[PDB]
């Protein structure tokens, strides 16, 4: 009823090639609750016991404690930098950060392996192929008929359950191994049957054989699916996270790294941003996003004057490509006044903040609330600009910023600059090849650009995993005007 009302009043207004994923914990923190919502689709509702493998492993408290310890040490490396700066202390500094990168990598790997397991396909953005799914249904039902003691009335599985198998990915690729994932999903199927009154004992089921036959069915699905590949769906995922789950870099889970994923405080917030989308100046999936003109942006570069490498990296590029030809406002090597900051938020389609922190030292959060409307899509390239709910990102979302890019923890200048440069190139703010005068530009959504830009960092986990975007997909409108 409430899921019915949520579907009708919120989700069915969301672009149909996007989906919304809600992540929360059960009372004791024993289960990960995942709800996938999509316009015109029945909801996926999952409750995943984190320790389910044991009775067939680390609990939430253990995982979160490990994460927070890693983050604490990462933050320490970002500021002990100045003191350590020498010539052989360099080696130790880089070694420490490499070790932390590996630690965080392994934590995310373990979360994906143990907590998500075979349900990682719930995050899949693959397009629905109704005719192929029913072919898979017939084969899979054949597997159940052959192997379940209960079939020596039959429960009929929902299509969304079958889509979890498809969502594991291309089973025909070299290196593909779905055995553990498939085992996890076969337990799920047996448990669904059990729930609806078709009962079986695990011990009487040859799961290993079902895995082989199910994998063979998936190879048949994907062989045929690959003959008509998905060209460009502009699929996007929006995460709604419960309070304890924001600190996790979900987007950097191995199975999510390639996907365009953003976060949103609430469904109410998502709905508001969608109703305020600007159309491009131009059956076109890009039309689902907000379109921000390239003209008239603002960049705030090295406002505290001490970030000389960051200034050096971008100042000439910004003068050449933004200030000179596209009427951008520039604030360089001086602090912006609060009126300047508020004016940029009000008038600029894009605001680039390349400085320390979130910029809260220059503009009060409550004045971001007083704004009749926040026009700007905002990139907060500084330490913990989206971290630790209440915070700067919260207020930009309240103000109606279409999107805000920020960091979950502290970062260092050159590596976040590599990321930022990648975002601007992918998004089309700067021409391709600028960071490596250029002309010709990409047109990824901001969310797609952020996901791709994580590749640019020396540390995918220590640096890039910090980077997240709150809001909806934003496209640059190159020839557009406000």
């Amino acid at each position: 009823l409430d899921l019915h009302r949520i579907q009708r009043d919120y989700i069915d207004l969301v672009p149909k090639h996007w989906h919304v994923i809600s992540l929360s914990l059960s009372d004791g923190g024993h289960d990960l609750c995942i709800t996938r919502l999509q316009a015109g689709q029945a909801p996926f509702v999952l409750r995943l016991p984190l320790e389910r493998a044991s009775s067939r492993v680390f609990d939430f408290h253990t995982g979160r404690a490990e994460l927070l310890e890693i983050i604490k040490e990462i933050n320490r490396t970002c500021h002990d930098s100045r003191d350590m700066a020498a010539k052989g202390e360099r080696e130790k500094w880089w070694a420490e950060r490499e070790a932390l990168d590996q630690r965080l990598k392994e934590l995310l790997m373990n979360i994906e392996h143990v907590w998500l397991g075979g349900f990682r396909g719930v995050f899949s953005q693959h397009g629905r192929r109704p005719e192929l799914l029913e072919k898979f249904r017939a084969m899979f039902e054949g597997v159940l008929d052959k192997h379940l003691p209960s079939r020596r009335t039959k429960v009929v599985l929902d299509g969304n359950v079958l889509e979890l198998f498809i969502g594991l990915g291309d089973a025909t690729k070299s290196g593909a191994d779905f055995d553990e994932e498939l085992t996890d999903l076969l337990y799920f199927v047996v448990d669904i049957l059990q729930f609806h009154g078709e009962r079986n004992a695990y011990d009487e089921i040859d799961f290993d054989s079902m895995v082989v036959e199910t994998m063979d069915a998936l190879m048949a699905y994907h062989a045929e699916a690959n003959a008509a590949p998905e060209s460009d769906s502009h699929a996007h995922t929006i995460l709604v996270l419960d309070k304890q789950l924001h600190v996790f870099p979900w987007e950097s889970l191995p199975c999510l790294q390639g996907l365009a994923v953003s976060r949103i405080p609430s469904l109410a917030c998502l709905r508001k941003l969608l109703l305020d989308r600007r159309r491009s100046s131009s059956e076109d999936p890009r039309s689902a996003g907000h379109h921000a003109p390239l003209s008239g942006g603002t960049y705030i570069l090295n406002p505290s004057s001490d970030l000389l490498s960051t200034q050096k990296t971008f100042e000439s590029l910004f003068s050449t490509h933004l200030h000179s030809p596209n009427s951008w406002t520039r604030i360089i090597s001086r602090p912006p006044t609060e009126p300047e900051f508020l004016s940029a938020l009000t008038h600029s389609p894009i605001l680039l903040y390349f400085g320390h922190g979130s910029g809260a030292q220059y503009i009060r959060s409550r004045n971001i609330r007083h704004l009749d409307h926040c026009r700007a899509t905002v990139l907060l390239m500084g330490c913990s600009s989206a971290a630790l709910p209440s915070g700067p990102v919260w207020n930009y979302m309240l103000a109606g910023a279409p999107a805000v890019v920020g960091t979950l923890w502290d970062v260092t200048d050159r590596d976040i600059d590599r990321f930022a440069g990648g975002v601007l190139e992918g998004w089309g703010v700067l021409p391709e090849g600028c960071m490596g005068k250029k002309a010709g530009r990409n047109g990824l959504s901001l969310v797609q650009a952020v996901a791709k830009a994580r590749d640019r960092c020396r540390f995918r986990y220590v640096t890039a995993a910090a980077a997240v975007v709150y809001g909806i997909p934003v496209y640059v409108d190159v020839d557009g005007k406000s």
Binding site: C78, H79, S81, R82, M84, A85, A86, K87, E89, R90, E91, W93, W94, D306, L307, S309, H356, G357, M381, G382, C383, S384, T407, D410, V411, T412, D413, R414, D415, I416
Partner: peptide
Amino acid sequence: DKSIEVGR
């Protein structure tokens, strides 16, 4: 031997 990076 790359210079230590400066904090955000």
